[PDB]
């Protein structure tokens, strides 16, 4: 289709391809929503290939793509405005991925990222996360936003909230964390899980639709792996690292106490102890302002200094008076 | 709370004074108690406001701008509270769509071969189709 309607072939092909750029994007989203567990390999051969084509189209049709991207962003609140998570699907997870590919996430303000990041943060907080499918969906969202801030490393409070509840959800309460609001108390992991077998930490998108203990454990590992990365990159730099990490430290301690063999929280914890030790927590000082100079004023003057007609009319009279008055004498 | 002048470093300051600050610097401990229910006994007044400093790095641009005011002189007498009370995620997105200033959408020079990880360059490691 792109070859048959190149810009040079005929007038207006630029517009047709630009509209095609928006059309292709929805097709990429549309295929992801469709079931593909039967032919995942064939889907992978199409799904990445179409993205590559979209990247070429976006390089010349970013304007058309951005308009469609906003429209998909705008639409999905409306579906979230009535269906909540039932609106959310695999393609929505795919969509936020594609935006990062085709747009600069490391911007303070961007046309498509800022609507998307605000929208993803809303899911990270508003959504209940009361089912394994829902938690697994949240795990993917956390990874996407982490990649969005892979260079900017801006602080997202919802990420802090999401990690706290999910960690506490799988330990359900132990009566010492009453400040964290849980939405499901029946997802507590059993004591009998080994936590030493090598369980895949990758969450397939197709498994989301199908959604037991192993699936719960894998979601936990993926989420806390992102948690460790967040501490290392973002929270470490923030001035309030000790305050931000303090609730997380206690949650990870509960994991270790209940599970001596389970190693990741100890690694994250031991990492966390090193960060707090090196970081010097000091009284902040920000009102140290630069002094202000005395006021400045330019002088007004004449470039060529000199040592309305009614006034001139009066003036000439006086000279005329003096001559004529003399004349009479 | 926003700043302790005793912890500021002055250029002319004498080296013996310079050494003293580190000893003050090193021995500080945050005295604010979170479990104490008595607002007159939390020892908050002796602590400092680090948490607001992190809000300056908030992902949303305008929200960070509000946090930057505390790094700016307090010229304003007060802020109208009613203009900030009823704000919603929907309102933030609606305001974002209804933006007075329009910018140009741009693209990332970095190229990722695969958008998701397998079960060269992967944009989203740890997630697979």
């Amino acid at each position: 289709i792109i070859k048959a309607y190149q810009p040079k072939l005929a007038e207006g092909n630029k517009e047709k391809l630009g509209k095609f750029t928006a059309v292709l994007l929805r097709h990429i989203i549309f295929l992801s929503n469709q079931n593909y567990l039967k032919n995942v390999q064939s889907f992978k051969r199409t799904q990445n290939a179409l993205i590559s084509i979209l990247k070429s189209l976006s390089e010349k049709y970013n304007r058309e793509l951005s308009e469609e991207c906003r429209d998909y962003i705008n639409e999905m609140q409306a579906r979230y405005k009535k269906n909540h998570f039932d609106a959310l699907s695999n393609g929505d997870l795919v969509f936020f991925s594609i935006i990062g590919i085709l747009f600069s996430t490391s911007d303070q303000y961007h046309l498509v990222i800022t609507p998307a990041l605000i929208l993803m943060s809303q899911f990270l907080e508003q959504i209940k996360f009361n089912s394994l499918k829902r938690i697994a969906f949240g795990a993917v969202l956390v990874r996407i936003v982490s990649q969005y801030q892979r260079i900017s490393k801006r602080y997202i409070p919802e990420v802090v909230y999401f990690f706290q509840k999910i960690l506490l959800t799988f330990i359900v309460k132990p009566l010492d964390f009453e400040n964290i609001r849980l939405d499901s108390y029946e997802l507590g992991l059993p004591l009998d899980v080994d936590f030493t077998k090598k369980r895949s930490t990758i969450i397939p998108l197709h498994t989301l639709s199908t959604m037991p203990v192993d699936q719960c454990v894998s979601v936990l590992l993926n989420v806390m792996e992102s948690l460790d990365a967040t501490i290392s990159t973002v929270w470490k730099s923030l001035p309030a690292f000790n305050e931000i990490i303090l609730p997380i430290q206690q949650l990870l301690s509960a994991y270790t106490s209940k599970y001596s063999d389970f190693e990741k929280p100890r690694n994250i914890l031991n990492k966390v102890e090193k960060l707090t030790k090196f970081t010097e927590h000091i009284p902040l000082a920000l009102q140290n302002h630069k002094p202000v100079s005395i006021p400045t004023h330019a002088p007004k003057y004449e470039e060529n200094f000199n040592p309305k007609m009614k006034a001139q009319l009066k003036k000439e009279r006086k000279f005329t008076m003096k001559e004529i008055r003399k004349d009479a004498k | 709370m926003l700043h302790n002048p005793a912890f500021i470093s002055n250029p002319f300051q004498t080296p013996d004074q310079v050494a003293n600050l580190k000893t003050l610097k090193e021995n500080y401990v945050d005295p604010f108690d979170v479990h104490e229910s008595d607002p007159e006994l939390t020892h908050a007044l002796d602590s400092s406001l680090w948490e607001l400093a992190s809000l300056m790095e908030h992902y949303h641009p305008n929200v960070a701008t509000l946090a930057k005011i505390f790094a700016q002189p307090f010229k304003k007498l007060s802020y109208n509270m009613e203009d900030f009370l009823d704000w919603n995620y929907d309102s933030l997105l609606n305001a974002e769509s209804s933006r007075k200033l329009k910018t140009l959408p741009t693209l990332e020079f970095e190229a990722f071969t695969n958008v998701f990880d397998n079960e060269g360059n992967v944009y989203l490691p740890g997630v697979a189709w």
Partner: peptide, 30 residues
């Protein structure tokens, strides 16, 4: 230049080269 352009935008340079502070006028009032 692309690397430099990206760095300035992380600092708040906005291309139409306005700044983020310009975008925060009137937002909170309405």
């Amino acid at each position: 230049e692309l690397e430099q352009q990206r760095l300035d935008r992380m600092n708040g340079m906005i291309e139409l080269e306005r700044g983020v502070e310009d975008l925060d006028d009137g937002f909170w009032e309405n």
